[PDB]
């Protein structure tokens, strides 16, 4: 397998300043769509940087989530993928971490204007 | 119209075959879904198929027991229900979506809030025992 | 591309290529990124618009009446079809969606991304 | 670390040159931003450049009047301000972001909320007339 919101998947993202390559992503689509839709919505994860310098970025510790480096989730780098691109599931983000993702998503998509 | 038939009373372990027939138009290019509605419970897409017959969906609670198949020659979509359980007691509806279709995904049309173009009057299915 | 990209703008954008049930090709899109990102970021976040269907059938779809917004056909915004585009992919600006329509877009966007916590 | 200077009081139409020097690291590998803070208003990114001297952002309010330039021999960055206006009155800050950089985009690092690694102390620029 099931695809759940908050899962960290390894996905083939090529071809694409859009992030590209077989890279880790986090599922951000609602769980009803994750079950019935042929596609999922994901946010990019990068290991180039290690700190969230704007509030649309969320850090994740490698010492906590079985990860390569200390990475940053880029909630302004989001794309819809056909489910066939999801290769291997690595882990999932806790409810605490996904709350930061939700907040970053609210900022990124401008759902914070009143 | 869209007309369902085949419901009735069966004991646990019994089997039923529901029919979804269209009159005046053809279902061959339509997406067809079977939905069930239980008293006090919500609505769930049981099994759905796209206009193409490569993509079929089954809810987890009916996989291995229910089989959907379209009989184009009879303008009818059947739902074969095997190994029926008391939890299958509900009113079963079929619904049809006319082209154009956005996705070739049976699961897409089985999601709980899809607005179908056509649907039937439902058929009662009771399992007790 | 553009010079003032604003949230709710409807741009002609190049999406080629894609794979699977993803929406690609040169097609209309709606900017959904916040206006600070639309000004400073090298990329924009868009939701795809299709003309293959013109009625919304699931909660993440929003309709556009062509008798109001100057499109070829009645169209549907696909809030399950989101992607981040380099600003160079934005070709021509067609129009922009009203405040009342972006309210519907915002709702479908919250449902699409599970922002109901 | 990041030492800046060059501010002062000038009349409308005058010019100034702000300087931003770094001690202990090489500015050529950094994204550099110039920010100004006016009383009661949000921090505004006025001119930024990525670590590559070929992706420069200028705010529309300063386009054609301000010029940013890096002097890799002096480990210093400058903001040349011409045709100064009373609306340019603010405290000006330079800031440096260490690599690796996520985007080669000057405009990205000029957004108001970006938390640079290093900041200058700030210098006041005042443009007024009697």
Count of C-beta atoms within a 10 Å radius of residue B118:
16
> Which residues are CB-contacts of D16 (< 8 A; sequence separation ≥ 6)?
D6, D7, D8, D10, D80, D81, D84, D125
Give, for A108, the enclosing helix (H) or strand (E).
helix A95-108
Phi, psi of B16 (to 5 degrees): -140, 160
Spell out a b/e string for C88-106, using b for 16 or more CB atoms within 10 Å of the CB, else e: ebbeebbebbeeebbebbb
CB within 8 Å: B113 and C52: no
Distance from CA of C39 to the nearest CA of D (A): 8
Task: Check: CB of residue A101 under 8 Å from CB of residue A26.
Answer: yes
Give me the numbers of helices (H) and strands (E) for chain B, helices first please.
1, 11
Report the Cα–Cα distance between both ends of chain C, in Å, rounded: 36
CB within 8 Å: B115 and C56: yes
d(CA B92, CA C7): 44
Bridge partners of residue D10, in order along the sequence: D127
Task: Check: CB of residue A103 under 8 Å from CB of residue A69.
Answer: no
Angle at B45 between CA B44 and CA B47, to 5 degrees: 145
**C-alpha distance from residue D75 to each of A7, B81, D121 (Å):** 45, 78, 17
DSSP code string of C42-97: SEEEEEEEESS--S--STTEEEE-HHHH--SS-EEEEEEEEEEEEGGGEEEEEEE-
Chains near D (3 or more Cβ pairs under 8 Å):
A, C
Residues of D in contact with A16 (CB under 8 A): none
Task: Check: CB of residue A26 under 8 Å from CB of residue A42.
Answer: yes
Interface probe for D, chosen from A54, A59, A76 (most Cβ of D below 10 Å), is: A54
Task: Check: CB of residue C43 under 8 Å from CB of residue C88.
Answer: no
Distance from CA of A63 to the nearest CA of C (A): 27
**C-alpha distance from residue A97 to each of A27, C22, C70 (Å):** 13, 28, 42
CATH of the domain at A90: 2.30.30.110
**Residue of chain C minimizing CA distance to D114:** C40
The token pair that represents B29 in the structure block: 């290019």
Residues of A in contact with C82 (CB under 8 A): 41, 78-80
Question: What does the H/E/C string look like for A37-78?
Answer: CCEEEEEEEECCCCCCCCCCEEEECCCCCCCCCCEEEEEEEE
How are strands ordered across the β-sheet holding C43-50?
C61-64, C75-86, C43-50, C26-31, C9-14, C90-96
Q: Which of A60, A58, A53 is nearest to D118 (CA)?
A: A53
d(CA B48, CA B65): 15
DSSP code string of C26-43: EEEEEE-S-HHHHHHSSE
Q: Which of B72, D39, B57 is nearest to A36 (CA)?
A: B57
The token pair that represents C113 in the structure block: 């991304």
d(CA A103, CA A107): 6
The DSSP secondary-structure symbol of A7 reads E
Task: Check: CB of residue A60 under 8 Å from CB of residue A72.
Answer: yes
Number of domains forming the structure of chain A: 1
Count of C-beta atoms within a 10 Å radius of residue B26:
9
- CB pairs B-C closer than 8 Å: 22
HSE-up (13 A, CA, CB side) for residue D72: 6
Task: Check: CB of residue B5 under 8 Å from CB of residue B19.
Answer: yes
Q: Which of D57, D68, D79 is nearest to C39 (CA)?
A: D57
Interface probe for A, chosen from B111, B113, B114 (most Cβ of A below 10 Å), is: B111
The region that residue D65 occupies, defined by phi over 0 for left and psi between -120 and 50 for alpha, beta otherwise, is alpha
Give, for C10, the enclosing helix (H) or strand (E).
strand C9-14
C51 burial (CB, 10 Å; 0-12 / 13-18 / 19+) is: middle
d(CA B85, CA B67): 15
d(CA D116, CA D31): 9
β-pairing, D76-81 with D16-22?
A: antiparallel
Residue with tokens 């290529």: C17
> Which residues are CB-contacts of C44 (< 8 A; sequence separation ≥ 6)?
C5, C31, C33, C37, C38, C84, C85, C87, C90
All structural domains of chain D: 2-127 (2.60.40.10)
Distance from CA of C32 to the nearest CA of D (A): 18
d(CA B104, CA B21): 22
Task: Check: CB of residue A29 under 8 Å from CB of residue C114.
Answer: yes
Q: Helix or strand or coil: residue B90? A: strand
d(CA D114, CA D105): 13
D50 burial (CB, 10 Å; 0-12 / 13-18 / 19+) is: buried
Task: Check: CB of residue C27 under 8 Å from CB of residue C91.
Answer: no
HSE-up (13 A, CA, CB side) for residue B80: 8
Residues of B in contact with A37 (CB under 8 A): 103, 105, 107-108, 111
Task: State the method.
Answer: X-ray
Angle at C98 between CA C97 and CA C100, to 5 degrees: 125
d(CA B85, CA B65): 10
Give, for A26, the enclosing helix (H) or strand (E).
strand A23-27
Task: Check: CB of residue D75 under 8 Å from CB of residue D26.
Answer: yes
Count of C-beta atoms within a 10 Å radius of residue B84:
21
Q: Helix or strand or coil: residue C105? A: helix
Phi, psi of A20 (to 5 degrees): -140, 160
Task: Check: CB of residue A65 under 8 Å from CB of residue A93.
Answer: yes
The DSSP secondary-structure symbol of D108 reads G
Spell out a b/e string for D56-83, using b for 16 or more CB atoms within 10 Å of the CB, else e: bbbbeebeeebebebeeeebbbbbebee
Q: Which of C47, C45, C114 is nearest to C80 (CA)?
A: C47
CB within 8 Å: B114 and C58: yes
Domain housing A77: 2-113
Task: Check: CB of residue D87 under 8 Å from CB of residue D61.
Answer: yes
Distance from CA of B7 to the nearest CA of C (A): 28
CB within 8 Å: A48 and D115: no
d(CA D71, CA D113): 26
Q: Helix or strand or coil: residue B85? A: coil
Q: Which of C106, D43, D100 is nearest to A71 (CA)?
A: D100
> Which residues are CB-contacts of B23 (< 8 A; sequence separation ≥ 6)?
B1, B3, B75
Q: Helix or strand or coil: residue C116? A: coil
B29 burial (CB, 10 Å; 0-12 / 13-18 / 19+) is: middle
CB within 8 Å: B103 and A35: no
The DSSP secondary-structure symbol of D110 reads G
The token pair that represents C60 in the structure block: 């993440």
Interface probe for B, chosen from C57, C75, C79 (most Cβ of B below 10 Å), is: C57
Residues of A in contact with B45 (CB under 8 A): 36
Torsion C11-C12-C17-C18 (CA) sign: positive
Instruction: Tell me if chain D has a CB within 8 Å of the CB of C42.
Output: yes
Residues of D in contact with A51 (CB under 8 A): 115
d(CA B47, CA B55): 11
């Amino acid at each position: 397998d099931p695809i759940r919101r908050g899962d960290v998947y390894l996905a083939d993202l090529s071809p694409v300043s859009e992030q590209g390559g077989v890279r880790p992503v986090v599922i951000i689509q609602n769980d009803t769509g994750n079950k019935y839709s042929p596609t999922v919505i994901v946010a990019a994860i990068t290991g180039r940087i290690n700190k969230a310098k704007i509030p649309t970025h969320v850090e994740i510790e490698k010492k906590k989530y079985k990860l390569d480096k200390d990475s940053v989730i880029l909630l302004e780098q989001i794309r819809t993928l056909d489910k066939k691109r999801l290769k291997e599931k690595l882990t999932y983000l806790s409810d605490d971490k996904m709350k930061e993702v939700d907040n970053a998503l609210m900022i990124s998509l401008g759902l914070n204007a009143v | 119209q869209l007309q369902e038939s085949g419901g009735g009373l069966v004991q646990p372990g019994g089997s039923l075959r529901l029919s979804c027939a269209a009159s005046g138009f053809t279902l061959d290019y339509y997406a067809i879904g079977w939905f069930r509605q239980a008293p006090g419970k919500e609505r769930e897409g049981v099994s759905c198929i796209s206009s193409s017959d490569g993509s079929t969906y089954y809810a987890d609670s009916v996989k291995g027991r229910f089989t959907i198949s379209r009989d184009n020659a009879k303008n009818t979509v059947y739902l074969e229900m095997n190994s029926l359980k008391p939890e299958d007691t509900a009113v079963y509806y079929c619904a049809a979506e006319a082209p154009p279709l956005l996705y070739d995904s049976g699961s897409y049309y089985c999601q709980p809030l899809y607005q179908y173009d056509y649907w039937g009057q439902g058929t009662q299915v009771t399992v007790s025992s």
